[PDB]
Design a protein around this ligand. Structure first.
Ligand SMILES: Nc1ncnc2c1ncn2[C@@H]1O[C@H](COP(=O)(O)OP(=O)(O)O)[C@@H](O)[C@H]1O
Ligand SMILES: [Mg+2]
Lengths: 33, 526, 43
């Protein structure tokens, strides 16, 4: 009833680029030092 | 003064440029890396590669196809991108040759780098290569043989071409069976180039030798509830109608009444309209009904009452293939039954492949549409087999279009290179050196083929060169035991179109890359 | 992907956002698709 459970080229040797960028390199290097 | 190497900075942050040395070096390294990657998968003894995706899904793919390898790799080198696009275009134009064109372009660019190291202007190399390409193309065209007139010899050529195409793939284990399968599948197209008409079904389990080409057709769709599961002497009607509460296409229309009884009358009218649609369909005198779109419960109940099979949701490809294989017409209106052709087949039944049930059409009328069941031990095996079958079918269709054939096994490369060398021997200047480098790359192709098998590539290539210079225009590599032999006797033949496309595309891309002397990169988005 | 609500089946599989007659819709990453043909019709 209702009731239920529901309920390559590695060697580079960069030539001139370091010379070109040395200005910024030293700019950062002074503050880092 | 250079753009980047100037006291004043003219670039955004992250944008740079590469001048003569750096541009040529970047291009050559990229091209050589791509060629070395794609090679070692070349020839009958080429091996496969595993492609691990770095995405969340981490897709696994083992393959021998050069274009597939070159597509699924993160490439940042612009020259490598050029070579990858070359390989993709070669795959689009013809089936095989994706690895050969890439390796040839890489070898040409290596020779170009060597020549540039010898103080030769790149424009001189380009002119020499243009002349060499003209000579090689003329020689290859003159060496072509056509057998389209004779049916038996053309079928033999098709068998040989399919075998040569499949010799480098994982299907080389059952090369004979798979070659027969592919040749039958292509010949069933009745001369049509429609490769979409050939459906490849990959079912896991079973052996690769258990793969077969069905004599009829196989559909992976389902039948209705009360519909018959088996029809003999079927009369097919392929349709592309709505059949799912087919609303009148006046989208501004609405039901606007003052009582629910009128609403009930209107819904009864809609059901009557659907019933009349089904009655008009049945007026054609049919046993089976394939509709591209869905079929809802009321139309399928009507069909089951009529006792006719009703296959639903067969996509555009499905209905096109059924029309090709049975000869029916894809009809969207049913007011003129006499003007609509009905498909026919001897038997329709459900077959049990693996653990899945498919609809089988037997004794088809036309048959100009094939289904191929591929069985394998892994999903990777099934994918590689499907790719190899695609290559074989593409090459066979191209051969059907153009029946001219050339001899493989390095014979075509040897004869083209011999013609290039003959031209170079009567040319003054450094253009002769460029021509010799072109011939060197052409030699290097079968050299790599022989290297992949572990044979003495240098001696074999020297023997081939001597034989072709003497006049043995059909000499080629015999890969069964590592000697040289007659490619005509051994049946190592290729499509003339594939070889010519490989040659021309490789030369064109090498010329394109060689012209670059400055690579300028914009600042990336990231 | 476009799905049929009543039958619960995938009609056709073809996209940060998209918008729509329920036959032609545009998807942006324009890409206009027509359900009658199942092809891109505008770009
Ligand atoms: N049975 C064979 N004997 C000799 N050479 C073969 C044989 N089968 C294929 N080759 C050579 O292997 C080369 C590479 O073919 P393959 O790797 O299948 O595709 P792709 O041409 O895209 O590299 C072809 O140029 C062909 O000449
Ligand atoms: Mg191949």
């Amino acid at each position: 009833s209702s009731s239920e459970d529901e309920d390559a080229g590695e060697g580079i040797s960069v030539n001139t680029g370091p010379k070109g960028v040395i200005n910024d390199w030293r700019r950062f290097k002074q503050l880092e030092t | 003064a250079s753009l980047s190497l100037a006291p004043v900075n003219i670039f955004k942050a992250g944008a740079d440029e590469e001048r003569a040395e750096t541009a040529r070096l970047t291009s050559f390294i990229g091209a050589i890396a791509i060629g070395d990657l794609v090679k070692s998968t070349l020839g009958p003894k080429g091996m496969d590669k595993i492609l691990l995706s770095s995405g969340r899904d981490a897709s696994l793919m083992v393959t021998n196809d050069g274009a597939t390898i070159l597509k699924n790799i993160g490439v940042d080198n612009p020259a490598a991108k050029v070579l990858v696009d070359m390989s993709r275009v070669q795959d689009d134009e013809v089936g095989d040759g994706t690895t050969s064109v890439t390796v040839l372009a890489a070898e040409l660019l290596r020779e170009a780098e060597s020549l540039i190291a010898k103080k030769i202007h790149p424009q001189t190399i380009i002119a020499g290569w243009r002349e060499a390409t003209k000579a090689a193309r003329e020689a290859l065209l003159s060496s072509a043989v056509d057998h389209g007139s004779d049916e038996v010899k053309f079928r033999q050529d098709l068998m040989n071409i399919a075998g040569t195409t499949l010799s480098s793939k994982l299907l080389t284990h059952h090369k004979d069976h798979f070659t027969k399968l592919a040749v039958e599948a292509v010949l069933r197209l009745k001369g049509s180039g429609n490769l979409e008409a050939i459906h490849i079904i990959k079912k896991l389990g079973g052996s690769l030798a258990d793969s077969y080409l069905d004599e009829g057709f196989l559909l992976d769709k389902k039948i209705g509830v009360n519909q018959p599961k088996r029809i003999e002497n079927a009369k097919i009607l392929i349709a592309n109608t709505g059949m799912d509460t087919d609303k009148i296409k006046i989208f501004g229309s609405r039901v606007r009444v003052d009582s629910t009884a009128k609403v009930a009358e209107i819904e009864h009218a809609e059901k009557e309209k659907m019933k009349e649609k089904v009655e008009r369909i049945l007026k054609h005198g049919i046993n089976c009904f394939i509709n591209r779109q869905l079929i809802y419960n009321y139309p399928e109940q009507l069909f089951g009452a009529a006792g006719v099979m009703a296959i639903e949701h067969a996509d555009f490809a499905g209905v096109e293939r059924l029309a090709l294989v049975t000869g029916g017409e894809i009809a969207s209106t049913f007011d003129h039954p006499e003007l609509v052709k009905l498909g026919s087949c001897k038997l329709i039944e459900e077959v049990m492949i693996g653990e899945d049930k498919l609809i089988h059409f037997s004794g088809v009328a036309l048959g100009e549409a094939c289904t191929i069941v591929l069985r394998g031990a892994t999903q990777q095996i099934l994918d590689e087999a499907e790719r190899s079958l695609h290559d074989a079918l593409c090459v066979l269709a191209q051969t059907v279009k153009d029946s001219r054939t050339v001899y493989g096994g390095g014979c075509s490369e040897m004869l083209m290179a011999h013609a290039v060398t003959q031209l170079a021997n009567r040319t003054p200047g450094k253009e002769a050196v460029a021509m010799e480098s072109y011939a060197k790359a052409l030699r290097m192709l079968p050299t790599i083929i022989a290297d992949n098998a572990g044979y003495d590539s240098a001696d074999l290539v020297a023997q081939l060169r001597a034989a072709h210079s003497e006049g043995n225009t059909t000499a080629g590599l015999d890969m069964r035991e590592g000697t040289i032999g007659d490619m005509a006797i051994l049946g190592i033949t290729e499509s003339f179109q594939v070889k010519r496309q490989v040659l021309l595309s490789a030369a064109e891309a090498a010329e394109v890359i060689l012209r670059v002397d400055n690579i300028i990169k914009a600042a990336p988005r990231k | 992907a476009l799905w049929d609500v009543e039958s619960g089946q995938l009609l056709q599989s073809f996209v940060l956002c998209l918008d729509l007659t329920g036959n032609t819709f545009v998807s942006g990453g324009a890409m206009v698709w027509d359900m009658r043909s199942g092809q891109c019709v505008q770009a």
